[PDB]
Design goal:
Distance between the termini of chain A: 7 Å
Radius of gyration of chain B: 15 Å
Number of helices of chain A: 8
Number of helices of chain B: 1
Number of strands of chain A: 4
CATH class of one domain in chain A: Mainly Alpha
Radius of gyration of chain A: 20 Å
Chain A: Calmodulin-1
Helix content of chain B: 55-70%
Largest interface: A-B, 23 and 18 residues
CATH topology of one domain in chain A: Recoverin, domain 1
Order of helices and strands of chain A: HEHHEHHEHHEH
PDB class: membrane protein
Structural class of chain B: mainly alpha
Shape of chain A: elongated
Strand order of the largest sheet of chain A: 1-2
Oligomer: heterodimer
CATH superfamily of one domain in chain A: EF-hand
Structural class of chain A: mainly alpha
Keywords: Calcium-Binding Protein, METAL TRANSPORT Ion channel Neuronal Molecular recognition, membrane protein
Shape of chain B: rod-shaped
Assembly: dimeric
Strand content of chain B: under 5%
CATH architecture of one domain in chain A: Orthogonal Bundle
Entry title: Solution structure of full-length apo mammalian calmodulin bound to the IQ motif of the human voltage-gated sodium channel NaV1.2
Chain lengths: 148, 31
């Protein structure tokens, strides 16, 4: 779900170390958003203040490498978190029954967003539905997609 | 119209599309 890969960690390692003052594995709370912009992400001042409220609760004005990766995980989860997917599915769930009709999910997935391919939206129904009855159970599908 | 949701409907789909194509990598993983 929220784990970084060794490729994500080494990219964040380099971009964080580009603003490390001593090689001690740390930056300032002021440099945080400049470090995020080195990864090409431009955060809002309200987002930076909210992340620093939790990371710098002692008011030191500083952040360590693992405390930066702590927020960078959540900033990546803003497009694919388990709670984000469960809420996004509940918008399509017609009854609140914890499921979506196979032709209904096939409609949304090929009307809205990036579009899935003809065989790719079909591949979704094979594993989103328990047996191919025409009922996707998204409450299991979200757990399956987010599990390592 | 009753039950209208287009603002949220069109953006909710994208979150599931990110999750789905990420999971597709597990269906083609090296073994």
């Amino acid at each position: 779900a929220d784990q970084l890969t060794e490729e994500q960690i080494a990219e964040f390692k380099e971009a964080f170390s580009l603003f490390d003052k001593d090689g001690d594995g740390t930056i300032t709370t002021k440099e945080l958003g400049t470090v995020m912009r080195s990864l090409g992400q431009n955060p809002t001042e309200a987002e930076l203040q909210d992340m620093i409220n939790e990371v710098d609760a002692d008011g030191n004005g500083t952040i360590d490498f693992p405390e930066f990766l702590t927020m960078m995980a959540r900033k990546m989860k803003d497009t694919d978190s388990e709670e984000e997917i469960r809420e996004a599915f509940r918008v399509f769930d017609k009854d609140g029954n914890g499921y979506i009709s196979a032709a209904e999910l096939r409609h949304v997935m090929t009307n809205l967003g990036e579009k899935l391919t003809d065989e790719e939206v079909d591949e979704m129904i094979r594993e989103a539905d328990i047996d191919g009855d025409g009922q996707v159970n998204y409450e299991e599908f979200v757990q399956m997609m987010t599990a390592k | 119209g009753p039950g209208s949701k287009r603002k949220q409907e069109e953006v909710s789909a994208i979150i599931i599309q990110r999750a789905y194509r990420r999971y597709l990598l597990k269906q083609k993983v090296k073994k």
